[PDB]
Amino acid sequence: MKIEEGKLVIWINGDKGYNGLAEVGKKFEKDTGIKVTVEHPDKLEEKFPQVAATGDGPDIIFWAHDRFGGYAQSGLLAEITPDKAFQDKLYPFTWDAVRYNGKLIAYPIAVEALSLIYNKDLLPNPPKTWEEIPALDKELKAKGKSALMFNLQEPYFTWPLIAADGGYAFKYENGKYDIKDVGVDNAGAKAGLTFLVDLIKNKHMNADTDYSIAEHAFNHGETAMTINGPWAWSNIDTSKVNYGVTVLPTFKGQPSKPFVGVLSAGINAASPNKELAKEFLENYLLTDEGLEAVNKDKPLGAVALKSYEEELAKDPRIAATMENAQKGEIMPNIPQMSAFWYAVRTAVINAASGRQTVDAALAAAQTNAA
Ligand SMILES: OC[C@H]1O[C@H](O[C@H]2[C@H](O)[C@@H](O)[C@@H](O)O[C@@H]2CO)[C@H](O)[C@@H](O)[C@@H]1O
Ligand SMILES: [Cl-]
Ligand SMILES: [Cl-]
Ligand SMILES: [Cl-]
Ligand SMILES: [Cl-]
Ligand SMILES: [Zn+2]
C-alpha cells in the first residue's frame, strides 16, 4: 500500500514539538498496539498536496489552517466527525478556522502569533516602534551587537510590518473573501516593505537572514531582539539568555499586524486508518496530557483546548502572544492562500535582495496573488 494500514504516519514542522508528539504516539501504541511515526519533512505543506493527490503521504498532517482550504478543495482531506461534547472543548473561533465549504476538515490544536522577543540584559526597555530600530542598531553595533534579526526568507515574519500600515491579503466582506481583491500593493504595504528594505540598505539587517541565522544570533547574544513564535522559547530557555516576550513594535503609529495561524491536524482522505487517526487525535493528542507533552518539547503557545489554555494564559509570554494575535488577523483558509504566499514570498525576497524595487515587487505580487 502507498499508505500502510495499521499504523499512523504523521507530518509536523521541524521547529515544533515533534519529539513530544512522538511521546503521545508511544502512549497510543502502548494502549492500542498501533504504532505512530512522526516525520518532519521540510516544506511539508508544499509536499502534502503533491503526494496526497496520488493517494500517498501521511495519515495525519499538522500545519496552520491557512493551507487546509486548498487541500480540502482538492479532495485531499477526510471530513472529521467530533460530536458537540468534543467541539465544546475547543474555542469556537478555532473551529471556524477549519470549516470549509460545509465540512470540518481538521482538528484545531493551537493559536499562533509572532511576538517581539528581546534580550533583557541588552535592552531592559525594548523599542515600542520600528522607527527606533535603526538608531538602536547603530548604538548596539558600537558595542559589537545588532538590534534585530528575524527570518527574512519566509514572508510570515515580515507580514506583520507589511500589514501594519494597511496591507492586507484578501478582502473579506459580506460573508465572503473576494479572491480578485488583494491588498498586497496598497500604500500601506509599500510603506512597510520599504521600511524593511531600508533597514537592509542601511546595514541594520542582512537580506540572507533566515530562520537558523536569526535564532542562532539571538540565542548566542549576538542580536538584542528577534521576532518568532512560541515554539522558539524552548531553545532560548536552553541558551540561558535572559529574555522577554512582548508586543511587536508599531509602524507609522500603527500596531504590527501578525497573521494568526491555528495549528491544525488534518486526516489524509487516502488514509486507510481514518478511525485510528480519529482515536489518536481525540482521545490522546487533544487532551491536557497530550498537549502538555508536545508543549514540554516546544511550546504550542496559546492552545485551542480551553481547559489547558486556562492554565497557559497565566504565563506572561502567552499573554503577549494573545496581545499580538488580537492586533493581527486570522488567516483565510481559502485555496487562493497558496498563490498569495508564493506572491508575497517572491516579493519580499526580491525587494530585500535588491532584485526588484518595492513598487515592482508588490505590483507583481498583486498580479500573482489574484
Ligand atoms: O511564510 C509563509 C508561510 O507562513 C505560514 O507558515 C508558518 C506556520 O504557520 C507557522 O506554524 C510556522 O511554522 O512558521 C511558518 C512559516 O515558516 C503559513 O501557514 C504557510 O502556509 C506559509 O507558507
Ligand atoms: Cl528559513
Ligand atoms: Cl558563532
Ligand atoms: Cl483532558
Ligand atoms: Cl480561493
Ligand atoms: Zn554566531
Curated annotation (Swiss-Prot):
A single GO BP: cell chemotaxis
Keyword terms, alphabetized: Periplasm, Signal, Sugar transport, Transport
Regulation: induction: Induced by maltose and the transcriptional regulator MalT. Permanently repressed by cold shock in a PNPase-dependent fashion.
Subcellular location: Periplasm
Keyword Transport: yes
Keyword Glycosyltransferase attached: no
GO terms under cellular component: ATP-binding cassette (ABC) transporter complex; ATP-binding cassette (ABC) transporter complex, substrate-binding subunit-containing; maltose transport complex; membrane; outer membrane-bounded periplasmic space; periplasmic space
Entry's family note: Belongs to the bacterial solute-binding protein 1 family.
Function: Part of the ABC transporter complex MalEFGK involved in maltose/maltodextrin import. Binds maltose and higher maltodextrins such as maltotriose.
Subunit structure: The complex is composed of two ATP-binding proteins (MalK), two transmembrane proteins (MalG and MalF) and a solute-binding protein (MalE).
Protein name: Maltose/maltodextrin-binding periplasmic protein
Organism phylogeny: Bacteria, Pseudomonadati, Pseudomonadota, Gammaproteobacteria, Enterobacterales
